[PDB]
Design a protein around this ligand. Sequence first.
Ligand code: ADP
Ligand code: ADP
Ligand code: ADP
Lengths: 86, 86, 86, 112, 112, 112
Amino acid sequence: SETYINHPTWGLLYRICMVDESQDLFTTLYAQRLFFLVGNDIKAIKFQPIGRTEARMLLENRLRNLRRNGQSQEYDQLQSVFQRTF
Amino acid sequence: SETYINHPTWGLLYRICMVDESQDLFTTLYAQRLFFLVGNDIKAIKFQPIGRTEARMLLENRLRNLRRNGQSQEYDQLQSVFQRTF
Amino acid sequence: SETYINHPTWGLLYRICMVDESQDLFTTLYAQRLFFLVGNDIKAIKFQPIGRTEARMLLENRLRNLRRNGQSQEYDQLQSVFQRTF
Amino acid sequence: MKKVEAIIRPFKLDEVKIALVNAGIVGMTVSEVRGFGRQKGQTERYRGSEYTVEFLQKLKVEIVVEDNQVDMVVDKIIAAARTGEIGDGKIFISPVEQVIRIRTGEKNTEAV
Amino acid sequence: MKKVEAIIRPFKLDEVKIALVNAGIVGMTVSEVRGFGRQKGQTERYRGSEYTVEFLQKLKVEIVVEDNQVDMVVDKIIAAARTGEIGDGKIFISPVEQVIRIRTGEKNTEAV
Amino acid sequence: MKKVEAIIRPFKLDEVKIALVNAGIVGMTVSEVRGFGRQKGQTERYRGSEYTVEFLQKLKVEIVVEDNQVDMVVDKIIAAARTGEIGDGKIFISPVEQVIRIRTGEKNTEAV
Ligand SMILES: Nc1ncnc2c1ncn2[C@@H]1O[C@H](COP(=O)(O)OP(=O)(O)O)[C@@H](O)[C@H]1O
Ligand SMILES: Nc1ncnc2c1ncn2[C@@H]1O[C@H](COP(=O)(O)OP(=O)(O)O)[C@@H](O)[C@H]1O
Ligand SMILES: Nc1ncnc2c1ncn2[C@@H]1O[C@H](COP(=O)(O)OP(=O)(O)O)[C@@H](O)[C@H]1O
């Protein structure tokens, strides 16, 4: 499910993964390449910057959990996001 | 007076009523249908979610006050907003 | 270096000067004419309103410091921004 | 085929959309734009200071239709979007030489 | 000359850009738009309440190219932007009668 | 009638607007767009890390004018918008077959 939000400086961001119920990891579509952690459950939207190294590791961790769970569709989709992004 | 603001997630919002000097009630133009209360007098913009039931009741209350005050133009305009929205 | 950001109400803003490492002064492109001070180093973006009189004085101060420093390119560019804006 | 491009008051989006869908026009693209024209912004007050919005918020709704649908789509948009006050907006008609559906590679009438 | 206008899923921007640049198309303009069509939004949940996004986020990528580049640019965009699911978007071709480069006053083929 | 579409540096908006209004062109539509081309973004630093803005902020100003106003409008936009540096933008001219004023149903020359 494609999810986007707008950052006041960087413009349109794309959700590369859903971290949990309250939290999403986004990347910039117009800049190469910034990452932000954004809370779902917050009235003021805050963009927590996330480093590129850490972003990569977080996705790899999720990839590994998805294949262990046999969530193969979600794995395949995240894998393609990962390959495109990193 | 048409008033809009942009929500980072939901995009363009339209002011359905001016609650008071410091506060406006907005609805989503691109989603069917979310409501937000937004403060005028605040440096960080916060979007307070408002339920659909409550939104409806708040407008009905204002409608009733406008007709009691004989604010017939403002009533007519709000009435059309109400009919369109609910 | 052209720098812009988006204000949820007022829309696109243009950086008229870089106040310091953490802070920029912006003006509205679509409204005539609002000013905002915006922090670089903040996860929630806050727009601090700045009065027109004060905005003018702040730029004049910077103009004077640039010519004293012999920063003539930066002076010339800021001078043209100043003339356009005020 | 023709592109129909309507600059409307944003709150009119739902009415215009319903009118088009009811007329069997089932796809459209909407962009946010700022209009400058005869309609002026109300010289407002913020921190007790004067200013005017010079470029007012509008939406541009774009639909690509068959040549023989233009008058019908125009009539529907006009009735849905008008208010009678200056600032209601404009509709522009321009030629579209080809349409391709990305998913299939389908063209023209079969792509819309 | 022709304007090529592609409505795509936003995350496909990088792929489309790389494809165009690889095909020697070195300039393009991108706008954010909302699409309404056959693809529906997922009826989501916010504060435990139902709602649907009716106008879905897309990007419009516009490139002005020579007449004899249209098929090539179209093919490149299609291969880069498609997913096979409804909502992949559309490409519209329309005429451009003149191009002027602002910096120089250069025209047509020399302006792009 | 023709659509004139200028991609400009956003801070040039006021200059372009004044130039058009002075030339008796009293209506225009402005959209925010991102440009990719020969002009590159400055490889900046955020949390002490490198990155480049690839798609740079521009504005698209659209005006629909009479055929015999195109050269005049073009000249005015160019003089107002140019800086002499790469990234100044482009102007595209395309045909407009009909204009309708939504408030009245007025057409063509009488709708602009
Ligand atoms: N020459 C033009 N080209 C493109 N868009 C225009 C032009 N003139 C006006 N517009 C757009 O149409 C909108 C309506 O213009 P305005 O003159 O205020 O109202 P009305 O259409 O009722 O006379 C403007 O806000 C602007 O977006
Ligand atoms: N008649 C039209 N004119 C302009 N844009 C359209 C039209 N129909 C659809 N679109 C755009 O194309 C996108 C894709 O439409 P959709 O019907 O959902 O998918 P598909 O192209 O795969 O059938 C939409 O989100 C919308 O932006
Ligand atoms: N083929 C094209 N089609 C549409 N827009 C373009 C095209 N090429 C460039 N642009 C737009 O024009 C702007 C200026 O391009 P650029 O090559 O950087 O500067 P210059 O026009 O001075 O050479 C870009 O930022 C982009 O928005």
